[PDB]
Design an enzyme around this catalytic site. Structure first.
Site, PDB file in Angstrom:
ATOM      1  N   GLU A  66       6.975   1.457  -9.663  1.00  0.00           N
ATOM      2  CA  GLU A  66       7.241   0.235 -10.394  1.00  0.00           C
ATOM      3  C   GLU A  66       6.100  -0.731 -10.188  1.00  0.00           C
ATOM      4  O   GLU A  66       5.255  -0.514  -9.329  1.00  0.00           O
ATOM      5  CB  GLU A  66       8.525  -0.399  -9.853  1.00  0.00           C
ATOM      6  CG  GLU A  66       9.714   0.484 -10.067  1.00  0.00           C
ATOM      7  CD  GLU A  66      10.994  -0.143  -9.554  1.00  0.00           C
ATOM      8  OE1 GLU A  66      10.912  -1.225  -8.958  1.00  0.00           O
ATOM      9  OE2 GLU A  66      12.066   0.467  -9.748  1.00  0.00           O
ATOM     10  N   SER A 116       3.698   9.440 -15.906  1.00  0.00           N
ATOM     11  CA  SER A 116       3.089  10.550 -16.626  1.00  0.00           C
ATOM     12  C   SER A 116       4.177  11.189 -17.509  1.00  0.00           C
ATOM     13  O   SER A 116       5.271  11.487 -17.036  1.00  0.00           O
ATOM     14  CB  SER A 116       2.506  11.583 -15.655  1.00  0.00           C
ATOM     15  OG  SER A 116       1.389  11.064 -14.925  1.00  0.00           O
ATOM     16  N   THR A 154      -0.962   8.344  -1.792  1.00  0.00           N
ATOM     17  CA  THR A 154      -2.402   8.026  -1.657  1.00  0.00           C
ATOM     18  C   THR A 154      -2.892   8.808  -0.446  1.00  0.00           C
ATOM     19  O   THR A 154      -2.116   9.060   0.467  1.00  0.00           O
ATOM     20  CB  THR A 154      -2.744   6.524  -1.470  1.00  0.00           C
ATOM     21  OG1 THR A 154      -2.348   6.067  -0.155  1.00  0.00           O
ATOM     22  CG2 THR A 154      -2.113   5.633  -2.592  1.00  0.00           C
ATOM     23  N   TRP A 210       3.224   3.425 -14.958  1.00  0.00           N
ATOM     24  CA  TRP A 210       2.276   4.557 -14.823  1.00  0.00           C
ATOM     25  C   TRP A 210       2.977   5.907 -14.754  1.00  0.00           C
ATOM     26  O   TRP A 210       2.630   6.788 -13.950  1.00  0.00           O
ATOM     27  CB  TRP A 210       1.337   4.359 -13.628  1.00  0.00           C
ATOM     28  CG  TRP A 210       0.438   3.130 -13.740  1.00  0.00           C
ATOM     29  CD1 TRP A 210      -0.142   2.620 -14.868  1.00  0.00           C
ATOM     30  CD2 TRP A 210       0.032   2.281 -12.661  1.00  0.00           C
ATOM     31  NE1 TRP A 210      -0.880   1.497 -14.559  1.00  0.00           N
ATOM     32  CE2 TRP A 210      -0.787   1.269 -13.207  1.00  0.00           C
ATOM     33  CE3 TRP A 210       0.294   2.277 -11.281  1.00  0.00           C
ATOM     34  CZ2 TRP A 210      -1.355   0.267 -12.422  1.00  0.00           C
ATOM     35  CZ3 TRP A 210      -0.249   1.293 -10.512  1.00  0.00           C
ATOM     36  CH2 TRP A 210      -1.076   0.287 -11.080  1.00  0.00           C
ATOM     37  N   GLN A 266      -3.523   1.752  13.138  1.00  0.00           N
ATOM     38  CA  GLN A 266      -3.950   2.516  11.979  1.00  0.00           C
ATOM     39  C   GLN A 266      -5.375   3.100  12.062  1.00  0.00           C
ATOM     40  O   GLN A 266      -5.634   4.188  11.506  1.00  0.00           O
ATOM     41  CB  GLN A 266      -3.765   1.703  10.697  1.00  0.00           C
ATOM     42  CG  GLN A 266      -2.281   1.535  10.327  1.00  0.00           C
ATOM     43  CD  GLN A 266      -2.127   1.059   8.919  1.00  0.00           C
ATOM     44  OE1 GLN A 266      -3.115   0.647   8.290  1.00  0.00           O
ATOM     45  NE2 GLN A 266      -0.887   1.083   8.397  1.00  0.00           N
ATOM     46  N   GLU A 275       0.582  11.048  -6.236  1.00  0.00           N
ATOM     47  CA  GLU A 275       1.355  11.968  -5.382  1.00  0.00           C
ATOM     48  C   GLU A 275       1.129  11.687  -3.898  1.00  0.00           C
ATOM     49  O   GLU A 275       0.973  12.615  -3.092  1.00  0.00           O
ATOM     50  CB  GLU A 275       1.085  13.443  -5.719  1.00  0.00           C
ATOM     51  CG  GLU A 275       2.013  14.429  -4.922  1.00  0.00           C
ATOM     52  CD  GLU A 275       2.786  15.380  -5.822  1.00  0.00           C
ATOM     53  OE1 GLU A 275       2.520  15.351  -7.041  1.00  0.00           O
ATOM     54  OE2 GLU A 275       3.656  16.154  -5.332  1.00  0.00           O
TER      55      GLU A 275
HETATM   56  C1  LIG Z   1      -2.517   8.043 -14.078  1.00  0.00           C
HETATM   57  C2  LIG Z   1      -1.509   7.988 -12.951  1.00  0.00           C
HETATM   58  C3  LIG Z   1      -0.329   8.690 -13.175  1.00  0.00           C
HETATM   59  C4  LIG Z   1       0.825   8.346 -12.509  1.00  0.00           C
HETATM   60  N1  LIG Z   1       1.984   9.069 -12.749  1.00  0.00           N
HETATM   61  C5  LIG Z   1       3.156   8.704 -12.095  1.00  0.00           C
HETATM   62  C6  LIG Z   1       4.343   9.382 -12.350  1.00  0.00           C
HETATM   63  O1  LIG Z   1       4.376  10.329 -13.159  1.00  0.00           O
HETATM   64  N2  LIG Z   1       5.480   8.994 -11.676  1.00  0.00           N
HETATM   65  C7  LIG Z   1       5.479   7.955 -10.766  1.00  0.00           C
HETATM   66  O2  LIG Z   1       6.518   7.622 -10.191  1.00  0.00           O
HETATM   67  N3  LIG Z   1       4.309   7.265 -10.517  1.00  0.00           N
HETATM   68  C8  LIG Z   1       3.149   7.635 -11.186  1.00  0.00           C
HETATM   69  N4  LIG Z   1       1.983   6.947 -10.912  1.00  0.00           N
HETATM   70  C9  LIG Z   1       1.957   6.131  -9.622  1.00  0.00           C
HETATM   71  C10 LIG Z   1       1.023   6.524  -8.475  1.00  0.00           C
HETATM   72  O3  LIG Z   1       1.641   7.503  -7.672  1.00  0.00           O
HETATM   73  C11 LIG Z   1       0.758   5.260  -7.622  1.00  0.00           C
HETATM   74  O4  LIG Z   1      -0.300   4.531  -8.209  1.00  0.00           O
HETATM   75  C12 LIG Z   1       0.461   5.562  -6.155  1.00  0.00           C
HETATM   76  O5  LIG Z   1       1.631   6.012  -5.520  1.00  0.00           O
HETATM   77  C13 LIG Z   1      -0.126   4.379  -5.358  1.00  0.00           C
HETATM   78  O6  LIG Z   1       0.693   3.224  -5.517  1.00  0.00           O
HETATM   79  P1  LIG Z   1       0.051   1.797  -5.950  1.00  0.00           P
HETATM   80  O7  LIG Z   1      -0.898   2.022  -7.082  1.00  0.00           O
HETATM   81  O8  LIG Z   1       1.209   0.884  -6.227  1.00  0.00           O
HETATM   82  O9  LIG Z   1      -0.788   1.321  -4.692  1.00  0.00           O
HETATM   83  P2  LIG Z   1      -0.189   0.645  -3.350  1.00  0.00           P
HETATM   84  O10 LIG Z   1       1.024   1.351  -2.780  1.00  0.00           O
HETATM   85  O11 LIG Z   1      -0.008  -0.833  -3.607  1.00  0.00           O
HETATM   86  O12 LIG Z   1      -1.410   0.815  -2.330  1.00  0.00           O
HETATM   87  C14 LIG Z   1      -2.556   0.003  -2.442  1.00  0.00           C
HETATM   88  C15 LIG Z   1      -3.559   0.407  -1.361  1.00  0.00           C
HETATM   89  O13 LIG Z   1      -3.026   0.053  -0.100  1.00  0.00           O
HETATM   90  C16 LIG Z   1      -2.876   1.203   0.716  1.00  0.00           C
HETATM   91  N5  LIG Z   1      -1.641   1.008   1.487  1.00  0.00           N
HETATM   92  C17 LIG Z   1      -0.384   0.773   1.012  1.00  0.00           C
HETATM   93  N6  LIG Z   1       0.448   0.634   2.056  1.00  0.00           N
HETATM   94  C18 LIG Z   1      -0.266   0.779   3.195  1.00  0.00           C
HETATM   95  C19 LIG Z   1       0.055   0.740   4.559  1.00  0.00           C
HETATM   96  N7  LIG Z   1       1.310   0.580   5.020  1.00  0.00           N
HETATM   97  N8  LIG Z   1      -0.968   0.935   5.459  1.00  0.00           N
HETATM   98  C20 LIG Z   1      -2.274   1.162   5.075  1.00  0.00           C
HETATM   99  N9  LIG Z   1      -2.593   1.188   3.739  1.00  0.00           N
HETATM  100  C21 LIG Z   1      -1.597   1.009   2.829  1.00  0.00           C
HETATM  101  C22 LIG Z   1      -2.802   2.381  -0.254  1.00  0.00           C
HETATM  102  O14 LIG Z   1      -3.266   3.583   0.335  1.00  0.00           O
HETATM  103  C23 LIG Z   1      -3.776   1.925  -1.325  1.00  0.00           C
HETATM  104  O15 LIG Z   1      -5.095   2.171  -0.866  1.00  0.00           O
HETATM  105  C24 LIG Z   1       0.823   7.276 -11.596  1.00  0.00           C
HETATM  106  C25 LIG Z   1      -0.347   6.568 -11.352  1.00  0.00           C
HETATM  107  C26 LIG Z   1      -1.515   6.919 -12.040  1.00  0.00           C
HETATM  108  C27 LIG Z   1      -2.495   5.795 -12.284  1.00  0.00           C
END
Ligand SMILES: Cc1cc2nc3c(=O)[nH]c(=O)nc-3n(C[C@H](O)[C@H](O)[C@H](O)COP(=O)(O)OP(=O)(O)OC[C@H]3O[C@@H](n4cnc5c(N)ncnc54)[C@H](O)[C@@H]3O)c2cc1C
Ligand SMILES: Cc1cc2nc3c(=O)[nH]c(=O)nc-3n(C[C@H](O)[C@H](O)[C@H](O)COP(=O)(O)OP(=O)(O)OC[C@H]3O[C@@H](n4cnc5c(N)ncnc54)[C@H](O)[C@@H]3O)c2cc1C
Lengths: 554, 554
Positions: free
Chosen positions: B150, B183, B396, B181, B461, B394
């Site tokens: 979300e 897919s 990060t 986002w 970390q 899937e």
């Molecule tokens: C093209 C693409 C396809 C996608 N398809 C799907 C889909 O089919 N279904 C679905 O559900 N989602 C989908 N997504 C979601 C995708 O899985 C997320 O973008 C991903 O899980 C990362 O979440 P975020 O972008 O909100 O980043 P965030 O969770 O906000 O993370 C931001 C940064 O902070 C880091 N971070 C976060 N928390 C911590 C912590 N506690 N400690 C240290 N570092 C941290 C992360 O590693 C990252 O570097 C898709 C995204 C892309 C762009």
């Protein structure tokens, strides 16, 4: 004796003339003049240029293009009397970082034009040639292009096939060939063209083929170009094949000496090299602002993400990379402004370091942004795409590593044929010592390897790449030791922060050099790795790809 | 006691059940059936699909899309009786590597559909749900999408805001929120949707908010999607916001148990994880073929460039990366086919390693190709663009590193509260010992750090990322020791080459683990680095970006 730090360090010497104290070159008037340029150039990129638009269009929007001409952007280093802005290298670097921050597509188009396209006229032009060509170069009425690369010849400039034959009257040369991937190729009316010509020995008259450089006008006739090439990034920059079909070039359009065109090419590229690290320091500054903004404002797991160590380490490493790069860029430009004759290794280091730093910094900015970093709208992926080529053009980083290592070896090989106290600031004495011990470790290995391999060191490429990396980290260390020491000495408001950037950088750089030099000298497995790299690659080549199947065997 | 290698190694144990001998899972008939699928799937991607076209169009060409449906590609792991191809994980991996080799855009569209989009139905579906939904999923008549992310919630799934309220009659839930986002978001008719629902405790009746998973049909009403998002790569894959406005979901469309939706999400993602390294092993295989072809045929400085050490080392490293990745992918899939219950750390390792390996391999293929690698026509830059997101979605890779480290620590922390002889092939005994010493070094540090930090290790970390890297290299080592040992044991024609890939990999992996563990345990500067990373990042955040000016100070 060389005043080059890099030349000395391969010989286990501390030659600090061109390093400490961190150079200041601008007089008060140059400083004020630059300030009054920085504002309008910054506003122009902020308010007029649209980088996402140029990228989408695969060219520079016409209003932007005309606006840059009006700004004087096509002639930044041309003397005022020849119609340019008359900037020195350091002033040029300051404006170049603005372009690098905002739009590398525009940056490449302007740099192809002036850092290299007509640079040879500034460096080697007669009075007649300068007066004839510079004014319309500087105003952008005639765009320039540097025409070296060919289908057969990229890294190996000496292998080019384009030819120039002198007429019997000696009044002109007839030019034939083609050039490949020429930035501004489809836009330029002035070309610096490198061609093989017959060259007469002054003593014996014996004729040999050598490269000669020419100033060539599109209007000489017989010149066409291909369509703009489609590529991953810097898409706004024109890139085209240029064809030369029976082109008559006046004999007086020889640039430099007949037969010295290779040296001319290399001097132009060396001279322009610092501009790259300058631009990319700006790219990184802009990118770090974006990553910081994201980390400041993104909540995940109940906190803003800048509170998590993984993110803090990413941010810290990015700024260290930016600081080292920017510090190298302005050191090299100062050395050039101060009349240095020997800065070629340091320039190569800055190009390798800056292009790789900017790539890594922008890659980690994507990682910090998560899913959003991959989206087109934020514009970070566009900058990553732009960046990839900076590791390949103006000397591939692989070839530049060989150059740094072999050039550094040269004087020590000829010969074969320590304290920073009082220079580093007292608050940086420990890191100063780290650098001196790293230098000693590095020089010991260089000497041992030259004695071992002699002239055959040229074929020891696994070793040379590793020596180049040592050299890179060693220069990085003293560059930040110098800059932070001056900051501390002056009581500059950021000095304690720079001291921290410096110490943090140096601790890890010293370790890379310690462990790297140990691998080269004392490690019995190193030779097994080298043998295996060769045998594995030989096996791939025999097969045409991966030798193994998958575990199922089909 | 866990049969997981990764679980054991954090405890300083050698648990080898799921590692040696390198698993073989397919019976003779499964092997023959897979062979007869590999040919037509390979031909389809060779002759029908055009990856450059899909990328240009930002969708899958309709003929290709229909052809994949006909091929059975939408239902590879659905049992034949429910209208799928009925493949096990290992057979699935074999076909997935074909897709990965050819077209990651297509790969993501098909994997979003089946590796995760309807995976939960396969894993947790009742008989009724499976019979109802699987046949049209498997034929691609109804495309699926996994709806977790979300605007507020990416890595932190537990923080999602989409809600599902049960009706008074208990016959349906009313679903409200949005997903980001997704897919296949704009293409799917079936959604696995994760929403917060009130959950009644069985003993006390006290109500708490927990995630529940739902199977949601587009035809339930109140469902819309946004327009396809523009992004750097996998541009053929549909990515869209999905909106849920007062959606009535039958109570019988709960997937798994009310309130166990978080566990459901995590199981689906874990289950699908191996597919990624499988696809990317294929990507790398294709890419290495391109780099080898370039190096074989490019003359520079008078020789084909495969004769230069810099190029040989690049090629060798690329194939090692491909071999390790492919070896992990098929090990994890075999473990799953053989009934393993504990493979989650190994799956996470394979995802991190494979995505980073493919990125590095494709990056170096560009470098090998020089100027040409940056051009659109060769298609390598398109694969680099596709690859960037595999490090982010899937899970990060940063979050997966924390997971690997903390999950590995868990059992050792509970407790706190060696030879490979006879398993490794005798020709690999030295590298087997390297792995065992690396394991001992690694476990010693883990124990010391858990005693030191206890439960507060979760906030350490910098340390955790470093432990995760040790874990990654340790698993990489035993994976290739196992695979090459079986090759040697069987006298397979590539065995001596695999032995070399294995030894070369292990020598450097052991060194990374030795030096990495030393940094964590014995190095007095390590804590100064950690302190400085935090202070430097704090300073950037205060400023909103780079703290220093350039050396000119304006
Ligand atoms: C093209 C693409 C396809 C996608 N398809 C799907 C889909 O089919 N279904 C679905 O559900 N989602 C989908 N997504 C979601 C995708 O899985 C997320 O973008 C991903 O899980 C990362 O979440 P975020 O972008 O909100 O980043 P965030 O969770 O906000 O993370 C931001 C940064 O902070 C880091 N971070 C976060 N928390 C911590 C912590 N506690 N400690 C240290 N570092 C941290 C992360 O590693 C990252 O570097 C898709 C995204 C892309 C762009
Ligand atoms: C968009 C862009 C703009 C350009 N603009 C211009 C321009 O304005 N003017 C101009 O003249 N050219 C221009 N070029 C050319 C560019 O500088 C060349 O692509 C570059 O010099 C590399 O040459 P190459 O592509 O022929 O690769 P090659 O020289 O064939 O190298 C191939 C690979 O082999 C490696 N290699 C080569 N020799 C050795 C060796 N001896 N030992 C070990 N490794 C080796 C290289 O590092 C590289 O990895 C442009 C190229 C690009 C794509």
């Amino acid at each position: 004796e060389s005043k080059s730090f890099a030349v000395g360090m391969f010989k286990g010497q501390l030659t600090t003339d061109q390093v400490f104290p961190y150079p200041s070159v601008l007089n008060e008037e140059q400083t004020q003049f630059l300030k009054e340029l920085v504002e309008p150039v910054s506003r122009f990129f902020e308010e007029v240029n649209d980088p996402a638009k140029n990228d989408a269009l695969e060219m520079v929007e016409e209003t932007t293009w005309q606006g840059l001409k009006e700004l004087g952007a096509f002639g930044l280093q041309v003397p005022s009397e020849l119609g340019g802005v008359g900037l020195c290298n350091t002033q040029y670097a300051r404006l170049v970082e603005i372009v690098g921050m905002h739009d590398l597509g525009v940056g490449i188009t302007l740099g192809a034009h002036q850092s290299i396209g007509f640079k040879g006229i500034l460096l080697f032009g007669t009075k007649a040639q300068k007066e004839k060509y510079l004014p319309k170069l500087a105003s952008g009425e005639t765009v320039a292009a540097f025409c070296l690369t060919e289908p057969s010849s990229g890294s190996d400039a000496a292998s080019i096939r384009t030819s120039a034959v002198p007429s019997p009257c000696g009044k002109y040369y007839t030019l034939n060939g083609s050039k490949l991937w020429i930035s501004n190729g489809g836009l330029a009316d002035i070309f610096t063209v490198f061609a093989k010509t017959p060259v007469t020995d002054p003593a014996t008259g014996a004729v040999k083929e050598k490269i000669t450089a020419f100033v060539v006008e599109r209007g000489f006739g017989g010149i066409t170009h291909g369509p703009p090439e489609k590529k991953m990034g810097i898409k706004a920059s024109n890139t085209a094949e240029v064809f030369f079909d029976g082109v008559r070039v006046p004999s007086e359009n020889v640039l430099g000496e007949v037969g010295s065109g290779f040296k001319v090419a290399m001097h132009i590229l060396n001279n322009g090299r610092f501009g790259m690290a300058a631009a990319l320091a700006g790219t990184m500054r802009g990118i770090i602002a974006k990553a910081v903004d994201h980390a400041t404002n993104r909540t995940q797991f109940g906190e803003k993400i800048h509170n998590f160590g993984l993110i803090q380490e990413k941010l810290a490493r990015m700024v260290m990379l930016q600081y080292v790069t920017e510090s190298m860029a302005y050191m090299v430009s100062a050395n050039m402004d101060q009349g240095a004759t020997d800065f070629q290794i340091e320039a190569a280091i800055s190009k390798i370091f800056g292009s790789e730093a900017a790539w890594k910094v922008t890659d980690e900015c994507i990682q910090i942004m998560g899913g959003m970093g991959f989206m087109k709208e934020p514009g970070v992926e566009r900058v990553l795409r732009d960046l990839r080529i900076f590791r390949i053009f103006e000397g591939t980083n692989d070839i530049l590593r060989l150059f740094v290592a072999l050039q550094g070896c040269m004087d020590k090989g000829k010969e074969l044929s320590l304290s920073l106290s009082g220079l580093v600031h007292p608050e940086l004495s420990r890191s100063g010592e780290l650098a001196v011990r790293a230098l000693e470790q590095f020089a010991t290995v260089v000497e041992a390897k030259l004695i071992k391999h002699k002239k055959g060191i040229v074929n020891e490429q696994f070793l040379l790449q590793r020596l180049a990396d040592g050299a890179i980290d060693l220069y990085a260390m003293v560059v930040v030791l110098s800059r932070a020491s001056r900051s501390l000495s002056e009581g500059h408001p950021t000095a304690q922060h720079e001291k921290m950037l410096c110490d943090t950088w140096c601790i890890e750089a010293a370790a890379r050099i310690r462990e790297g030099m140990a691998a080269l000298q004392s490690d019995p497995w190193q030779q097994e790795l080298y043998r295996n790299f060769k045998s594995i690659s030989k096996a791939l080549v025999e097969r045409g790809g991966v030798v193994t199947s998958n575990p199922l065997g089909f």
